[PDB]
Design a protein that fits this description.
CATH class of chain A: Alpha Beta
Disulfide bonds (chain B): 32-61
Pfam families (chain B): STIV_B116-like
Number of helices of chain A: 3
Structural class of chain A: alpha/beta
Number of strands of chain A: 5
Strand content of chain A: 25-35%
Keywords: viral protein, archaeal virus, crenarchaeal virus, B116, stiv, archaea, sulfolobus, crenarchaea, sulfolobus turreted icosahedral virus, hypothetical protein
Shape of chain A: globular
InterPro entries (chain B): STIV_B116-like, STIV_B116-like_sf
PDB class: viral protein
Largest interface: A-B, 18 and 17 residues
Radius of gyration of chain A: 14 Å
CATH topology of chain A: Rossmann fold
Number of domains of chain A: 1
CATH architecture of chain A: 3-Layer(aba) Sandwich
Oligomer: homodimer
C-alpha cells in the first residue's frame, strides 16, 4: 500500500473504525532508510506541507523532497513514517547536520512508524 | 486500569514502543455513559485543560468536571476517552444541548475510545 510521510499523527488520518494499529519508535538511520526505500519503490506519498520540516528531513536523510499538502487518509494496507518536532522550527533558519543531531540527541526530534496490525 | 479523558490523541501519550492500540468511534450516548462509568468507579482521570470544552462536556453528559491540566502517559492497561472538536469554540458563548447535538450531527465534534 501507500506510505505517508507526515510531521504529525492524528486519529483523522484513519479512514475507518474500529481499527488497530501498531506504532514503533525509529532511530534516525531507520527512518531515513525506510523513507529512501519508499521513495525508490514509489510507494511514499509525501504529506509534509512546510519547507522548514522538508529542509530538515532533506539535510538529515540526503533526500530531495519538496513540500506537498495532502490530506492523509489511511486504508488498512497503508502506513505512515512520522517525524515529530517539539519546538516550532524557524521558517528560514538553515540547520547544519550538527544542529539537527543535537535536537535529536536532546529529544526534540523523534521518529515513528505507524501501520495496521 | 486508568481511563484518561482528553481533547486530543497524540503519540506522546504512549509510554512504551512498540505498542498496538485499538481505536473506535463512539456516539454521544456511549461516550457519556462510558465517562459516567469511569467517574463512578474512580478510574477516570480528567485531562481536559480548557473550560470551554469542560462546559460542553458537562452540558452534554450532565457531569461536573472542572479544568484539569494533566500530562497524559498511558501504560498497556490504560485507555483514553477522547472528544475531537474540529473547530475552535466561541469564547463567551454558552452552548445549548441542542447546539452541541447540531455540532455533532455536522461532524464538528467526534468521540473516540483508545485502548491497547
Amino acid at each position: 500500500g501507500k506510505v505517508f510521510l507526515t510531521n504529525a499523527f492524528s486519529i483523522n488520518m484513519l479512514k475507518e473504525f474500529p481499527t488497530t494499529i501498531t506504532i514503533d519508535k525509529l532511530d534516525e538511520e531507520d527512518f531515513c532508510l525506510k523513507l529512501e526505500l519508499r521513495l525508490e519503490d514509489g510507494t511514499l506519498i509525501n504529506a509534509i506541507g512546510h519547507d522548514s520540516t522538508i529542509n530538515l528531513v532533506n539535510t538529515l536523510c540526503g533526500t530531495q523532497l519538496q513540500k506537498n499538502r495532502v490530506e492523509v487518509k489511511m486504508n488498512e494496507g497503508d502506513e505512515a513514517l512520522i517525524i515529530m518536532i517539539s519546538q516550532r522550527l524557524e521558517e528560514g533558519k538553515v540547520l547544519s547536520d550538527k544542529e539537527i543531531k543535537d535536537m535529536y540527541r536532546q529529544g526534540k526530534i523523534s521518529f515513528y512508524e505507524v501501520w495496521h496490525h
